[PDB]
Amino acid sequence: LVLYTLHLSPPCRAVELTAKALGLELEQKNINLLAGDHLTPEFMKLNPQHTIPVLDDDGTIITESHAIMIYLVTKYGKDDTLYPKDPVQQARVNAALHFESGVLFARMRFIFERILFYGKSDIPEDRIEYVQKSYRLLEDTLKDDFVAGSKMTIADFSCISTISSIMGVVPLEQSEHPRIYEWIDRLKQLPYYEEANGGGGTDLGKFVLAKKEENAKA
Amino acid sequence: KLVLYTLHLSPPCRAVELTAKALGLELEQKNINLLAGDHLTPEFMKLNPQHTIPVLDDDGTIITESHAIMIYLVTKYGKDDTLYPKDPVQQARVNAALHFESGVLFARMRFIFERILFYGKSDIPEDRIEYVQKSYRLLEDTLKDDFVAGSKMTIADFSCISTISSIMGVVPLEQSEHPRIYEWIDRLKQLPYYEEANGGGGTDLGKFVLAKKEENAKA
Ligand SMILES: N[C@@H](CCC(=O)N[C@@H](CS)C(=O)NCC(=O)O)C(=O)O
Ligand SMILES: N[C@@H](CCC(=O)N[C@@H](CS)C(=O)NCC(=O)O)C(=O)O
């Protein structure tokens, strides 16, 4: 299994968490977004949307982190605990997956991408507010121990990959979000959490802040 | 007995309406007027703590979120899997397109529309327009086949067209640069239920956002 990837990228780290949970080894091929590696004609052939992650499973090309996670659990999970087959339980996981793509990740990207790639040095107040609203939505979703119920699923891997990044840029206040902090501690009990995700999320937040300051020059 | 907490102006609600028509299902609609804050009540919060529509009530079981609802309906009621394949590779292509709709097409539409509809804004910033125009290109390049996830129509087409048919009325979609998107829109327009389930509401939402933008300027 080959992952076209960059550790700073949240949906990349979502798939790394999944592969660790599944006991799969991934061969990582680095796509340096900061050098434009994803903008080549060769990469475009892999993904016409020119985004990472992309999985190569023995020549079969699977794009998009959520799709990749679902595919890996379906094909290689010894059971379905990370992505239930039961239709109602599965719908709850799917709903949380799309909440991650549509709300958590999208709002993070609306602050990050312009800093990382287009030379911006500001974070508009409305976009901070949009992120804080996404934190409230998440806190209210965490009625159980994990985002899509009492068992940990790929939806948690998706959500934490983003949360562990954006909170270093838009602070996530513990007194106001106790459930999110208890849930982060559950994920930090995983032996592979820091290698698969924690380090990379912390590093992305710091990088965004460092880039914002550097870009302020000239 | 399928009940949908819904508003016909809402894209993800029309994606589910298109899915129910394709499956031959009847939905009882319970109208949720977002402008009146019907989704922000304590009773609605119990249906969905994210307070979004659509929400499905299937004989007492609550299922949130349009893409989840579509997969659920095809899974449970499809006479075969053509709208959401069981094959893991073809399914992955559909899932990738569905998350493209939520993460890219819908998100960028909402980043223009929400502030006008609900928070009184009267402008559309140029950087937001570009974000949407970039999304059109991403979609155009995705459409190498007749439908967004291959040569067969799936729930990913319903999701994508419910947003595209809305945002094109506000951020114009230039035809000369996007022939594949126009050809695809015409394939969906051949469905006998397309206008009723989706078309009219997409057109109405676009005109409604432009009207409300004007209203907000005038106080
Ligand atoms: N829905 C996608 C989002 C992928 C995504 O946006 N990745 C970013 C990096 S975090 C990217 O590749 N950006 C480069 C580009 O959009 O051109 C997923 O979860 O795989
Ligand atoms: N990923 C969700 C998105 C739902 C969504 O944002 N719906 C809007 C109407 S188009 C809504 O209910 N907005 C009210 C709010 O967020 O408070 C889906 O596809 O169901």
Side-chain angles (χ1 to χ4, degrees):
Chain A
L1 297 166
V2 169
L3 197 70
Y4 290 91
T5 187
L6 187 63
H7 201 56
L8 283 200
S9 165
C12 291
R13 282 179 276 108
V15 174
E16 285 185 59
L17 285 162
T18 303
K20 288 293 195 179
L22 283 170
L24 306 167
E25 281 300 305
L26 298 178
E27 185 182 305
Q28 293 189 29
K29 288 195 173 17
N30 211 58
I31 293 297
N32 187 4
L33 296 183
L34 303 167
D37 291 3
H38 50 130
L39 302 179
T40 67
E42 290 84 14
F43 195 75
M44 199 88 180
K45 293 184 175 71
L46 297 159
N47 188 355
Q49 295 150 30
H50 57 79
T51 64
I52 53 177
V54 175
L55 182 73
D56 173 345
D57 184 351
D58 190 32
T60 295
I61 309 300
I62 307 296
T63 68
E64 209 283 334
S65 68
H66 310 85
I68 293 164
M69 287 185 282
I70 287 173
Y71 172 84
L72 294 174
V73 177
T74 301
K75 196 162 150 75
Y76 303 113
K78 290 149 52 170
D79 53 74
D80 70 355
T81 184
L82 293 170
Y83 189 65
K85 286 177 207 160
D86 169 76
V88 171
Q89 295 186 327
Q90 189 180 288
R92 184 175 182 187
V93 183
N94 290 328
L97 292 165
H98 283 279
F99 171 68
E100 194 277 340
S101 60
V103 179
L104 301 181
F105 180 85
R107 298 172 183 200
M108 181 205 76
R109 183 171 166 150
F110 279 151
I111 292 178
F112 282 19
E113 170 181 22
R114 56 197 303 279
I115 294 168
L116 295 167
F117 297 101
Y118 299 110
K120 310 295 184 205
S121 47
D122 63 316
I123 303 180
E125 304 299 328
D126 73 326
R127 297 187 193 201
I128 299 174
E129 176 182 38
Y130 217 33
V131 166
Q132 290 161 328
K133 288 185 167 196
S134 85
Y135 294 163
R136 175 63 53 209
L137 291 165
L138 178 58
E139 174 76 10
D140 286 338
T141 300
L142 281 167
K143 43 167 208 87
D144 298 311
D145 285 350
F146 294 100
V147 66
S150 73
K151 287 178 217 316
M152 187 189 67
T153 62
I154 59 164
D156 290 289
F157 292 161
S158 191
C159 291
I160 198 64
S161 74
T162 294
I163 292 291
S164 69
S165 317
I166 186 62
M167 65 192 289
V169 175
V170 173
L172 201 154
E173 179 181 46
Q174 197 166 339
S175 76
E176 276 313 305
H177 311 84
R179 293 163 164 189
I180 293 169
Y181 282 83
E182 299 180 340
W183 165 79
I184 289 173
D185 291 340
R186 299 185 184 103
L187 295 176
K188 278 180 169 170
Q189 305 280 73
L190 297 168
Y192 55 78
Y193 178 81
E194 286 287 344
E195 174 182 340
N197 185 76
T202 300
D203 284 345
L204 172 61
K206 289 173 190 175
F207 192 77
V208 168
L209 291 188
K211 272 290 252 205
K212 178 186 179 288
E213 288 310 289
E214 189 66 23
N215 285 347
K217 298 166 177 289
Chain B
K1 184 185 193 301
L2 303 177
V3 167
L4 196 72
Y5 294 89
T6 189
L7 181 71
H8 193 65
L9 290 178
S10 164
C13 298
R14 290 179 270 111
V16 177
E17 294 184 57
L18 282 163
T19 299
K21 288 289 178 171
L23 293 167
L25 296 172
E26 291 300 319
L27 305 169
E28 175 185 340
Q29 296 189 34
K30 300 204 156 236
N31 200 69
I32 293 301
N33 172 1
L34 296 180
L35 292 166
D38 289 4
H39 55 129
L40 304 168
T41 69
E43 23 292 309
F44 201 79
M45 295 298 182
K46 301 161 180 190
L47 291 164
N48 189 357
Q50 292 157 25
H51 51 77
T52 55
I53 49 174
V55 172
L56 173 78
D57 172 356
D58 182 1
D59 202 27
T61 308
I62 304 312
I63 308 289
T64 68
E65 204 282 329
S66 71
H67 313 85
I69 289 164
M70 290 184 288
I71 286 164
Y72 171 87
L73 287 181
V74 179
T75 299
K76 179 163 188 204
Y77 300 104
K79 298 204 184 61
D80 61 18
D81 72 350
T82 179
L83 295 169
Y84 190 63
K86 290 166 199 324
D87 174 69
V89 185
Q90 294 170 26
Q91 198 178 282
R93 179 173 187 196
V94 174
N95 286 333
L98 286 165
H99 282 274
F100 173 74
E101 190 277 343
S102 58
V104 180
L105 303 176
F106 180 81
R108 303 177 183 193
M109 174 202 87
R110 177 169 163 149
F111 202 40
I112 294 169
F113 277 18
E114 179 177 14
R115 65 201 294 280
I116 290 165
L117 291 172
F118 304 108
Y119 298 110
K121 311 304 171 163
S122 63
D123 60 332
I124 302 172
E126 178 45 57
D127 63 354
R128 303 190 196 201
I129 294 176
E130 167 97 99
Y131 219 30
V132 170
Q133 292 292 349
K134 282 196 169 183
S135 83
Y136 293 160
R137 179 60 178 163
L138 293 164
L139 178 61
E140 174 83 8
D141 293 347
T142 304
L143 281 161
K144 58 175 200 71
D145 292 307
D146 282 352
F147 294 102
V148 298
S151 65
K152 295 182 156 104
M153 191 180 71
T154 64
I155 58 169
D157 298 281
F158 294 156
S159 193
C160 293
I161 195 63
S162 67
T163 287
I164 287 286
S165 68
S166 309
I167 183 59
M168 74 192 281
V170 175
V171 172
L173 170 71
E174 189 77 21
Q175 188 157 347
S176 72
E177 299 176 317
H178 307 92
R180 291 159 156 196
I181 290 171
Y182 278 92
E183 306 189 5
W184 165 83
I185 294 175
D186 283 349
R187 305 190 182 87
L188 304 175
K189 280 178 172 190
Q190 298 182 57
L191 301 161
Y193 57 80
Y194 175 85
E195 196 58 14
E196 160 192 13
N198 184 70
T203 300
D204 295 349
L205 175 60
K207 288 185 163 184
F208 186 66
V209 165
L210 302 175
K212 181 72 194 197
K213 175 188 125 46
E214 290 304 327
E215 174 187 301
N216 284 349
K218 299 199 248 284

